């Protein structure tokens, strides 16, 4: 039920390593951060006329924002994920779709598999408020990292 | 849930690393007897180290002529990734709906924070669908005594001859 321009949900969830994040605690930094959400790791990305596995969510690295990228997997598996796409970032995991609902992001079925967290986007204000949102109905829409950067570029020099 | 030892093994029917459908019954009307190591969670310390073991002792494995089929609650493209990682040649199938786990009984009520998990454990279920091999661990960190799920296993396909 998160709405842009709203106060974003708390939340924490274990990391690659188990080692728990709490989003509140990473505004405290002083910096927006992106929460990027998508149903499972190594999974494949259609885009329209090109469908592939490779995945661009690297991208968001660039960004001056904090980067959280969240799916239902297991730490293992996310810790391996981080290593193929050399991910410089944090991937917290939801095994019990706690967080996911929160932002009602997930699909309630996706061939076959229950309660997988669908495709998005939230950059929150240092502050807690939601100063982007993004989200797809569709499993393999991946984000456009491009903007969504300078999208999160903009709103940290927004409100420094 | 109660998979009695001697009692017939609950047939089920789920996906594969490639997301292609797997019967148990169907598997077993092939001949040979089953195998269904259930394990925890893929790219786990001692998971990995479960089912390379079963990748490594093939030799005796294959020569006792049954249809291995290693089993987690993780997403059929965590499992694909796990199989090429550690080169394995049976199929994996995933469970993640919980489905064979609450039906075998062998899940987790809860492991490092996570819920719903496949404890580690291995079926050998005999053409006939009786159960003949039941080892179920409450440590996630005990490993199966992998020779003799070998040796009792041919002890089955042995007895069909």
Same mark, same amino acid.
């Given at each position: 039920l998160?709405?842009?321009?709203?106060?974003?949900?708390?939340?924490?969830?274990?990391?690659?390593?188990?080692?728990?994040?709490? =989003?509140?605690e @990473?505004?405290?930094?002083? %910096?927006?951060?992106? =929460?990027?959400?998508?149903?499972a790791?190594?999974?494949?990305?259609?885009?329209?006329?090109?469908?592939?596995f %490779?995945?661009?969510?690297?991208?968001?690295?660039?960004?001056?924002?904090?980067? =959280?990228?969240?799916? @239902? !997997?297991?730490?293992?598996? =996310?810790?391996?994920?981080? !290593?193929?796409?050399?991910?410089?970032?944090?991937?917290?995991?939801?095994?019990? %779709?706690?967080?996911?609902?929160?932002?009602?992001?997930?699909?309630?079925?996706?061939?076959?598999?229950?309660?997988?967290?669908? %495709?998005?986007?939230?950059?929150?204000? $240092?502050?807690?408020? @939601?100063?982007?949102?993004?989200?797809?109905?569709?499993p393999?829409?991946? $984000? !456009?990292?491009?903007?969504?950067?300078?999208?999160?570029?903009?709103?940290?020099?927004?409100?420094?």
């Open positions: 998160v709405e842009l321009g709203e106060k974003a949900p708390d939340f924490t969830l274990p990391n690659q390593d188990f080692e728990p994040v709490n =989003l509140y @990473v505004l405290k930094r002083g %910096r927006p951060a992106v =929460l990027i959400f998508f149903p790791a190594f999974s494949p990305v259609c885009t329209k006329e090109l469908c592939t %490779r995945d661009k969510m690297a991208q968001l690295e660039k960004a001056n924002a904090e980067v =959280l990228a969240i799916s @239902v !997997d297991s730490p293992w598996c =996310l810790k391996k994920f981080k !290593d193929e796409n050399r991910l410089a970032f944090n991937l917290l995991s939801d095994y019990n %779709r706690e967080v996911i609902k929160l932002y009602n992001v997930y699909h309630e079925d996706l061939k076959g598999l229950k309660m997988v967290a669908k %495709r998005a986007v939230f950059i929150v204000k $240092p502050d807690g408020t @939601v100063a982007y949102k993004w989200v797809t109905d569709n393999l829409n991946e $984000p !456009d990292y491009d903007e969504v950067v300078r999208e999160a570029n903009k709103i940290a020099g927004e409100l420094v």
